[PDB]
Design a protein around this ligand. Structure first.
Ligand SMILES: CCn1c(-c2nc3cc(C(=O)N4CCC[C@@H](N)C4)cc(OC)c3n2C)cc2cccnc21
Ligand SMILES: CCn1c(-c2nc3cc(C(=O)N4CCC[C@@H](N)C4)cc(OC)c3n2C)cc2cccnc21
Ligand SMILES: [Ca+2]
Ligand SMILES: [Ca+2]
Ligand SMILES: [Ca+2]
Ligand SMILES: [Ca+2]
Ligand SMILES: [Ca+2]
Ligand SMILES: [Ca+2]
Ligand SMILES: [Ca+2]
Ligand SMILES: [Ca+2]
Lengths: 606, 606
């Protein structure tokens, strides 16, 4: 933001000055050796702040400041007299300002002095936000918008960030000078820049620099910027665009740089939405025709739109100008469309049933207003242990805003985290509760009902293909009781893990009755349909119907589940067929889209 | 750091307790439904902090604390009585502490509570330091020490960090329990761990976990840790080792986790040394036999060891226990040895003449006590522009401690930064000065000597193969004067760049007389031997002899160079043949090793 000019008496000096930059003078280096003093006078447009004739000591600082842009080339003068011989200096005032939404308010602001071309997190920080163009507004084009080098629809401009170049110079100022917009060679494959007139490519992959065609006088120019890559292990998420003013008055000599200015964009990360957030839409996809009814009733009850899943997770990206949903598809078919993004980056833990996120929490000082991502892993790497692909773990950690927590889920047969934990909206305290499966909770009910005389109750009743099981001989099973004692020990481990990494007290956790049967390789499957895993649409739940032993009319499992959830204000609605069997895979067909956080992601300091 | 135990009246509960971890009791979950109150008594060794019989409300917190390690299994008891039915709890106190030099003092300290297994920069931060094993103490082995899986010499242990596992448990405690040391699967290729008895590999590449063989009783165990990779774009520089306590009492059931503890190591980065640092050794390598003399005189004068270069840079890595020099070799033969490291990670800007570092500076608040790395680059990427390989730039930025500054040097023919800038030790102010080549400085002398009557002086005098040039017709050359006006404009650009990124005033910069001749493709070579580039060994300089025009006995160029450097207290010693010509490459054979910073790198906060 500075420029040093050296004037000499033998030859007049011509210098360009950009409004907003400090300019100092070097009059000592080329001063007459017999001269011991000097004095300076200049035109009204030129202001001198030097710190009545001065003794030409090297320590003196001659500062120059120009009021406004020049109407002609060298229309401002500076006379330097030595003590006599005079030295001349012809100055031209020009305005070169590169502007972007650095205040994160939706409106473009010029370069303001506190930013210093550095991106900073927080409410008191500065830096523009750039979105990944990962959707498909153009209904005709089947590919992604960022895969080509053209702007097809006007609706696509809403997704791109705006950048303006306003210039006020003399008319004949551009016959010997030139402007060039450029980006680093490492960042060029992540960003593409358009010039609006009607849009053409100036910057992008294999095009790091481009000469600009501007006229003299007062002229502003609009640019539209798009991102082509999410933040990852090889891309922190910053893009820096730069304008440069070059002197080309010498035909034989290469171009000389006179002025540079930059703006720094940050690529918006992918953010998940917890169950506590309101649902915008419910997605569903031969069987369970009656369950489609029970599903449609719940959506109509919770006032949520329904349209006709475990392999994908619906997130979003947001900027001050645009906010749209983006679906992350597991590696284990892309739904691109208007305001619908898509991103893609093999073990059984790579599926997104193993991928969940907590409500906003505060853990021992650190605030997580966007919650924390939760995924499962082994307790320690062995030959027979599984883990989520490192490439996937890196992506989630690269998004930064939602600090991932590694849980233990390798004990389960499937290995997903959603099958032993869940979150529900609560009226008091934190505003939510943590639902954890509990064998101890399930056993207590069965033993209490055995003492109640109804120990002859047969489970699996009213089922087409199932074996009746009595409460009496279920409690008398020494094999099942040992396994559910081992499973409880696993959930207890994760219980204390979540209590520490989410800052949860026991008064925020609710134990839900559930027991498991050991499979081959000592893996764990649910003995009856997993109730802790469900469909949460606000105050309305959609728990799978447990089909537990009938006692005095209604199922005792549902009675306890309701007894724990009704005081929260949660309307329970048990579904006849939530999960379905294949061929040997148990799946669920429901998936939700929820309203993004009101909290802007760029305001937290990771 | 917690563990929740649930006792039941129908069956006694046995529980293991690690000294240092908080333990809470769950007596409500399995309490008799008819019971409304309870009371607890325990052995003297067990301490209860509950917050005179209690009403069994869920909100009550029963906390347990054990004084010391158990001498026998379940030698401490806890009786829980309900109101009556009693529930039992047999406890075993064990000590499992993993220790490392987390205080960065050279001595191993246990896990202290403020660390929380998180590495933190600064004097008030915590975290152990790990060095890359990139040297070769074993004189016989030709390869690097970290390339194999064995500890050959006792001298090699000084380079490795120490980690201890101290355990105090009952004797029969280990027949049903087991300990396992492990590291993440992503970090395993960067670290190798040895167990000392005599050393064997427990952890490393393709070996993420390993069972430990410890006896019962009071027993400590030593581990030696080495790093295998410097921090890069794919490795932030953190390693996390973890110990795990497993329960294996159930033969049929898989191992259950009871306790985990970790230590976090940070891999020490590569640090450069500026000219202001004292020189430990001078390296040199047919011709200029007389110059070897003038070189040996300077080293003997500055009291520095000499032994018989531009393609390599001598840096260092340091830890609280060991500090050794490491040579970074440019991609454009490895000198491994005892306490001599080696690291390696094609354009003409990839050479390390384009790689330099500044003295310790403070720039607008931010402190850089280890200086800042300086390398050259084009002003903007064009088809005909050059740049340092992105892989190289990433490595320097990954070292973090010395923030790299991108300068402009694409104008030069060679393109190196050392041929137009240098640093010298000063007595006052900052303690250093910045030496910049200056055509304006050189022209002023020549014009002043023309006025002095000695304008008939012929340059290139006393040279075997050279053409005589007079000061008169050198100043009268309109071609040379335009080119040195363009070169000055380049150095002036970098001048303001360094003033802003190093926080330098004009009172810290010294202009050195020098001019250049344009070559093909408008590139720049020095017209006479570059003086700003030299050999700085403390107060003693080794400037190349300019062979400038002779005036009244001595060379006027040397007279001005001395006039600027002598007041600093710098003894100038001009060398007859500093640079040599090949075939078309101009090189220098000298290279220096300097004393590392007293400032420990882990104390600054990047
Ligand atoms: C109704 C099915 N069923 C179950 C049952 N319910 C499960 C739910 C999940 C689960 O939560 N997920 C499924 C995988 C993907 C995860 N994202 C979510 C996983 C399971 O085991 C693999 C489940 N099992 C065995 C038990 C049962 C007993 C009788 C009749 N039917 C029964
Ligand atoms: C004595 C040679 N010489 C020079 C001269 N001196 C140079 C030094 C460097 C330099 O600083 N480096 C060399 C490259 C690697 C960098 N790390 C450091 C680079 C140069 O041009 C490429 C130099 N030229 C042309 C000019 C001259 C005139 C007459 C007789 N001899 C003359
Ligand atoms: Ca497009
Ligand atoms: Ca779009
Ligand atoms: Ca859109
Ligand atoms: Ca999920
Ligand atoms: Ca070795
Ligand atoms: Ca070694
Ligand atoms: Ca050594
Ligand atoms: Ca160098």
């Amino acid at each position: 933001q500075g420029t040093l000019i050296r004037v000499t008496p033998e030859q007049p000096t011509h210098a360009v000055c950009v409004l907003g930059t400090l300019t100092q003078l070097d009059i000592c280096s080329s001063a007459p050796e017999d001269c011991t003093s000097f004095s300076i006078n200049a035109s009204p447009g030129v202001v001198v702040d030097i710190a009545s004739t001065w003794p030409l000591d090297p320590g003196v600082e001659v500062t120059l400041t120009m009021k406004v842009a020049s109407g002609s080339t060298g229309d401002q003068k500076v006379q330097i007299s030595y003590y006599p011989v005079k030295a001349l200096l012809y100055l031209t005032g020009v305005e070169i300002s590169l502007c972007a939404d650095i205040t994160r308010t939706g409106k473009v602001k010029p370069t303001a002095v506190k930013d210093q071309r550095t991106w900073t997190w927080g409410p008191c920080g500065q830096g523009a936000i750039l979105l990944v163009n990962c959707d498909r507004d153009n209904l005709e084009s089947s590919a992604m918008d960022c895969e080509d080098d053209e702007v097809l629809d006007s609706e696509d401009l809403q997704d791109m960030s705006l950048m303006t170049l306003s210039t006020k110079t003399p008319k004949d100022f551009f016959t010997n000078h030139t402007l060039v917009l450029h980006v680093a060679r490492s960042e060029m494959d992540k960003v593409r820049v358009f010039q609006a007139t009607k849009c053409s490519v100036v910057l992008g992959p294999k095009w790091p620099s481009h000469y600009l065609m501007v006229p003299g006088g007062k002229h502003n120019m609009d640019f539209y910027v798009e991102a082509l890559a999410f933040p990852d292990t090889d891309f922190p998420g910053l893009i820096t665009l730069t304008i440069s003013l070059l002197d080309t008055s010498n035909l034989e000599l290469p171009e000389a740089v006179v002025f540079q200015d930059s703006v720094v964009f940050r690529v918006a990360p992918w953010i998940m939405t917890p169950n506590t957030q309101p649902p915008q839409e419910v997605y569903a996809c031969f069987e369970n025709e009656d369950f489609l009814k029970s599903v449609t009733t719940l959506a109509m009850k919770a006032k949520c739109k329904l349209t006709i899943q475990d392999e994908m997770e619906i997130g979003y990206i947001q900027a001050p100008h645009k906010t749209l949903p983006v679906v992350f598809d597991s590696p284990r078919k892309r739904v691109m469309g208007p305001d619908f993004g898509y991103v893609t980056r093999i073990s059984g833990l790579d599926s997104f049933g193993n991928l969940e996120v907590s409500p906003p929490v505060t853990v021992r000082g650190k605030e997580y207003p966007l919650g924390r991502i939760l995924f499962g892993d082994s307790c320690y790497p062995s030959n027979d242990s599984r883990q989520m692909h490192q490439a996937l773990q890196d992506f989630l950690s690269a998004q930064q805003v939602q600090a991932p927590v590694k849980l233990y889920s390798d004990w389960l047969s499937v290995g997903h985290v959603d099958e032993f934990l869940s979150f529900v909206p609560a009226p008091d305290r934190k505003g939510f509760r943590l639902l954890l499966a509990s064998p101890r909770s399930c056993y207590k009910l069965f033993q209490e009902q055995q003492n109640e005389g109804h120990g002859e109750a047969l489970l699996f009743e009213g089922i087409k293909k199932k074996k009746q099981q009595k409460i009496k001989n279920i409690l008398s099973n020494k094999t099942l009781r040992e396994h559910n004692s081992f499973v409880e020990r696993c959930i207890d481990w994760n219980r204390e893990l979540l209590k520490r990494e989410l800052g949860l007290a026991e008064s925020d956790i609710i134990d839900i009755p559930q027991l498991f049967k050991l499979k081959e390789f000592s893996k764990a499957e649910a003995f009856f349909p997993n109730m802790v895993n469900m469909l949460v649409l606000g105050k309305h739940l959609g728990i799978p119907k447990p089909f537990g032993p009938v006692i005095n009319g209604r199922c005792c499992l549902e009675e306890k589940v309701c007894s724990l959830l009704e005081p929260l204000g949660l309307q329970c609605t048990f579904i006849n067929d939530f999960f379905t069997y294949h061929i040997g895979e148990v799946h669920a067909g429901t998936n939700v889209r929820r309203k993004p956080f009101s909290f802007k992601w760029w305001n937290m300091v990771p």
